Amino acid sequence: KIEEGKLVIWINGDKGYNGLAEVGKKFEKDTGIKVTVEHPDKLEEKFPQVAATGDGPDIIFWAHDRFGGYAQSGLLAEITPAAAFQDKLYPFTWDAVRYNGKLIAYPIAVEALSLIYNKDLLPNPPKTWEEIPALDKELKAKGKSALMFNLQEPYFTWPLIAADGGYAFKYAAGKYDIKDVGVDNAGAKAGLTFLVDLIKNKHMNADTDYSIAEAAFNKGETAMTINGPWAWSNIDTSAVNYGVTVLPTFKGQPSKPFVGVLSAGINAASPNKELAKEFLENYLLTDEGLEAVNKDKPLGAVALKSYEEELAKDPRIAATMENAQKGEIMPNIPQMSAFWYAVRTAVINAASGRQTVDEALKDAQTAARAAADNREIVMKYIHYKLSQRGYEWDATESEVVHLTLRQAGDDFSRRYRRDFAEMSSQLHLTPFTARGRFATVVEELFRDGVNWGRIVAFFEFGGVMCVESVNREMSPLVDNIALWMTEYLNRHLHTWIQDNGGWDAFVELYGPSMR
């Protein structure tokens, strides 16, 4: 149970929590409501665990992308700000905190990648990607290089890939279409081709990661880099006099980095939702409230119009907001993990020369489509198991695979009914060890090999954990178990299924039994 009468606030350690504590002290001074700010390690995983049992803080601070999964599992309360308060923030920041047509958090700050340049080696930064090769040829004559940024994570290379038309997921009617991916299209191919062309022309090295690029710019060895506000403090202490400006354009079109919006969500189980609403609207989201946090650790660009216009006097903050306005809001669905996993391998394989740009992106398009299909198999099965025990979950010829799989699971549960009853009763299920308990059992099931019988047991165990989660008043755990089953399907079971005739072969083997 969360204590009523006080506000407990969680925010990451790399933020200005001491400045946020000042706002809480001012709130406590005016109203007597005690405000406690904490920065637990790995709070992005710690919050859904404590919130799954109705515990945890009253207010959670994190990027908006994780709040979609939080809201789907019912961890966040719907905020109800008046129209006069919503006008005080930029409209696109409210779009980042809207899930299923409901606002689930208050926007605080805006964060996106920018072009960081060395003002000594490069007084006037290039406005286009195309003039970077010629810029590198002149710098190589002095022992320097033009650009060095992280090529191992697709978050840093995506603004160039998305510039000519690449997109992660299509957005229609307030919902992301996870089957409409845009890594295969010509815009993404043209952007990734230019990146690989830079590597082929020796302007960049395919092995450059975050640390190599940061160490290169912070020592004056390269003239430019691509990073966010989190890296400004390392360059401040260094001898490099750096500037921050808009990302270079590609084919006359702006680079489109993904925008992360630091947001404050209200715990759905908190008994102080009104006090939290009053604190966030009338104390934090003010010029004085944001200044106290920004003085401690800079927030970059902020969602509050009045204070953003003040922070924009520093050109590095205006450049952060400009690149965010030209980019795209990070999709707030857990299905982005499959997108990043596919695009990362596509960029890695294309840069090293193992595959062409066309093949690497086609493999990424099919990998994203396969992740959506495996998610469909998991969620249809879990929804059937939960409905069997009377629990609804919010999340005939074409359904032959789904109908055969659930009957095979029912046959497995019926054959070992007594064994399932003992296991389900004696199961050690907590939100803090559920993932480890799941991964341990799945390792045992497939240690001596993968077969269709063990896959049926794999699905049936995930259904048992979901049923036990709802029985033990931990229903938000069902959404996490479904994601764990989908991730193991995509990463480990998918190749065996493909090499053994696909799910059509499963129907042909188990189908005859069901007559």
Ligand SMILES: O=C(c1cc(-c2cc3c(cc2C(=O)N2Cc4ccccc4C[C@H]2CN2CCOCC2)OCO3)n2c1CCCC2)N(c1ccccc1)c1ccc(O)cc1
């Ligand atoms: O530890 C397990 C478990 C279940 C099976 C298993 C998988 C199969 C199968 C068979 C069994 C199996 O061996 N059992 C089925 C079963 C079902 C439900 C509860 C317990 C058990 C234990 C035994 C039953 N014994 C041996 C056979 O004769 C009857 C007595 O046929 C095709 O696929 N296996 C393991 C561990 C690795 C070997 C195979 N769970 C587990 C997990 C946590 C805690 C305890 C057991 C587990 C994993 C997935 C599940 O869907 C269900 C159980």
